[PDB]
Amino acid sequence: RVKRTYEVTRDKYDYVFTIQEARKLLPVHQYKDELLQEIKKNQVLIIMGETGSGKTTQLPQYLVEDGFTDQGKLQIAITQPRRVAATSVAARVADEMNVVLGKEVGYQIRFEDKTTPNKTVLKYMTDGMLLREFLTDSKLSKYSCIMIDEAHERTLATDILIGLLKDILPQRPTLKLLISSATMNAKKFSEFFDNCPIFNVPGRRYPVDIHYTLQPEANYIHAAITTIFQIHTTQSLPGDILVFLTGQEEIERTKTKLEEIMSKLGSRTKQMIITPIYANLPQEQQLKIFQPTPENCRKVVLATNIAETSLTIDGIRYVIDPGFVKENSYVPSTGMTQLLTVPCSRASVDQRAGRAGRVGPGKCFRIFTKWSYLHELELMPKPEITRTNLSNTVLLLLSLGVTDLIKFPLMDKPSIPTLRKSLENLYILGALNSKGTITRLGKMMCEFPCEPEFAKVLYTAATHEQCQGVLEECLTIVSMLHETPSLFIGQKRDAAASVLSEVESDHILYLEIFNQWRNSKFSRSWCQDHKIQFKTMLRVRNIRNQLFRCSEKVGLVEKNDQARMKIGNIAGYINARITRCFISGFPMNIVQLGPTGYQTMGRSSGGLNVSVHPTSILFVNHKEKAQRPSKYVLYQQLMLTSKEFIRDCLVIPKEEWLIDMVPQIFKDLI
């Protein structure tokens, strides 16, 4: 057992010069009679099982077959933290129920919902989407049963869903809600729901051999690629490899590197099937990961944390675990959120090692030493409510009537410095009155399927007297910002030079790409010529269509049309008006140029010496053109990899645009 410790490069490599029958084998099917009796007795139930027991797929099917839906009058809501896990598992259940997708089994995520009103029986949703359902219906009267799945992940939207549903259970006696999670300590969930009974599904798992490095690795990515090959060449099929990578940017760099080596190996090495899994994965790619691999082929799955708990790939025999999770961390004193990658806790690494033990005895490979596991790793994960901005959450709770906000029962309370900074952010955005009541702007911000800061940009373009009449340009740029990592094939500067010769900032470039694509009658041939992914732009047009319908219900489109007649915009004046709208929407994300470098303006934030990320076009202009750096820069994303980086950078040429748009911040700062 002590032989587990291994060395990388173990020795380089040479190159010549019935679907119904499978449902009964799941472990939840043998406990089906006992579990449905327990749901009838108890209003709330915690169901624990090993990952892959069948609880996400079979439990909604068991409720419909029993009769909880009541002939299709009452819908069943199933709550997912992951967006990919909502869409892909709903496709599986539609195959098992034999219905076509979106008619009797549908999904609802924020920009696409495949649901029909009368026919849909069970619906799979993102955890954020069921929160938005409270604004329309406070009692959730259309749902007979709600299932909060993956509750051990402890996301932000799950925590408020547990808090909001706690209030409604005395009001509704016929609503049954099921908490389903991995085999984690559910005593904390059971205490919250007044001594709730817990059901445990025993899982059949095989022992996994867990391997550690002798020394820590300089590059885990190179160590993970080498570990794939020493499994691929020296082991016997069938065995599939599951690799846990942090983000979609590292997955695609690993995939093209791993494809490059297999081209050099050629005929001698066996065929490798590389399937990526990440957050904004397209729908056609999600079918590829669940396909059974052909004979004489090895599947190598490159995945984020979605494959850890949310979904299982059948046939995994090898797991490679570097041990990092990319996450969003919010600090209340500084007041900003960062994208940073951290070593994950001991409980999550043990959850990743269990994936090799499903179909048989497997091997788990860890790129970190055993000494960097006993002492260097935390024991449990910190919940998301401990590090989140909470500005969108408090605005949603004030809309629902949660006035007290500190006696509102939660499993983990938010801290007072986080809750204070969340209230100050809504007051800056104008969503909250000085008397404290929610204003007409704040009720408007809850209507949009976006963050309240993006809803402020769309409000400013239609209404504000210096900015009035650029709503059509702002609906384009906000829609491009949701799909920014998937826009470009190859390097961004080559596609940027083709669409427009000189662009100042990223927001104006994203406007120019969508306009020239629209002028070409939405041609697929335009995107290949200018090196933009065509499948991404179809999603961007879907986002713009959904935001345009929400702007009509608010009334911003009618106020836009009256404004465009009066002003008579000139193309020099348009980019100035677009800049001022994003200043009012994102006033905290302004960076001042200093002697050492770019630096955060906020006096609570202080001086961070942030640098411009190399993918942004603002970095491309400074390296190639002789233009001096701009004094003020607005960013959409902040990222920490060895120094702080800003993405989606906007250029603010004028100092007085800060003071004119948001004087409540920048009167003191300037």
Binding site: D14, P216, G323, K407, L423, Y427, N433, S434, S642
Partner: protein
């Protein structure tokens, strides 16, 4: 000296005011709301766990 704001535990307001930001400051707003309620690292590129130009990673030999 320290003002208290109690929320309306239950007609439109278009803009906030150009003067309510002066009557109630931004930093004073969050403190005043809580009194009414009651209350009053760096990780370089692909670096491994526990460790401390591109040279293209080909672990393949002729």
């Amino acid at each position: 000296k320290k003002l208290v704001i109690k929320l309306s535990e239950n007609p439109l307001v278009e803009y906030v005011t150009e003067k309510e930001y002066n009557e109630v400051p931004v930093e004073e707003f969050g403190d005043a709301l809580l009194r009414g309620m009651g209350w009053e690292q760096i990780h370089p590129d692909g670096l491994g766990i526990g460790a401390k130009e591109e040279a293209s990673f080909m672990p393949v030999v002729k």
